[PDB]
């Protein structure tokens, strides 16, 4: 018999993104080639099958630095990290291939699905 | 020119609640009288003006245990912690006064607003 506040989840995500922009309580650095991205492990786990696997591992859960596969494009990662914290995906003709490949590696099934649909249309 | 995934914020919150139920990456214990509640500092900050103030404080940001004011009812806190992680508020005739008082202390303005509306109706 609960009541529900419709905007609550969106408002929580907006505040987590504000914490990220101000580098508050970030507990991991994701290294993609020369580029570094600060984030919250819990947000990464909630969005990605790959980060979920990494941070539930008894040894990796304690690492402050995670290095991604050298094939991963920093721009594709940046677009996906922004999507994790906002629900908004900056999908463009010039980045769609790098975004789909990064989403497949990160195991973000809904992003992979929209990339496959957008590629099929063109 | 971004696209948006409607269910993303709700799905993120659902996964953060799953991490909470399994005690994964919880980094703080909230003590309310004899009762203890494990949570994620970032989720508490995103939902509460009080926890936002506590965990942005250069000294308190590093505490693993936070003791609430002895006037705070553990049941009222539990209902509010569940709301933070689910958007669902278990508001009942028998708990509304304890929920409103706890939401005022935690600075959760939308919960305070619905409690005032529900009390006014009765």
């Amino acid at each position: 018999s609960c009541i529900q506040f419709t905007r609550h989840a969106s408002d929580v995500l907006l505040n987590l993104n504000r914490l990220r922009s101000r580098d508050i309580l970030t507990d991991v650095v994701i290294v993609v080639s020369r580029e570094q991205f600060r984030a919250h492990k819990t947000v990464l786990m909630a969005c990605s099958g790959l980060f979920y696997s990494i941070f539930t591992d008894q040894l990796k859960c304690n690492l402050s630095v995670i290095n991604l596969d050298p094939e991963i494009n920093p721009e594709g990662f940046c677009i996906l990290l922004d999507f994790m914290y906002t629900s908004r995906l900056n999908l463009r003709e010039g980045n769609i291939m790098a975004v789909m490949a990064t989403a497949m590696y990160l195991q973000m099934e809904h992003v992979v699905d929209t990339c496959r649909k957008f590629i099929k249309a063109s | 020119s971004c696209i948006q995934f409607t269910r993303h914020a709700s799905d993120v919150l659902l996964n953060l609640n799953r991490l909470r139920s399994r005690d994964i990456l919880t980094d703080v214990v909230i003590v309310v009288s004899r009762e203890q509640f494990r949570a994620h500092k970032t989720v508490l900050m995103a939902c509460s003006g009080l926890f936002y103030s506590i965990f942005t404080d250069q000294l308190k940001c590093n505490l693993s245990v936070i003791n609430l004011d002895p006037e705070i009812n553990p049941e009222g806190f539990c209902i509010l912690l569940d709301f933070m992680y689910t958007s669902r508020l278990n508001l009942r005739e028998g708990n509304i006064m304890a929920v409103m008082a706890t939401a005022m202390y935690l600075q959760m303005e939308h919960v305070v607003d619905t409690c005032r509306k529900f009390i006014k109706a009765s």
């Binding site: 609960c2 009541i3 529900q4 419709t6 | 508020l89």
Partner: peptide, 4 residues
């Protein structure tokens, strides 16, 4: 607020 809604009835979910």
């Amino acid at each position: 607020w809604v009835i979910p």
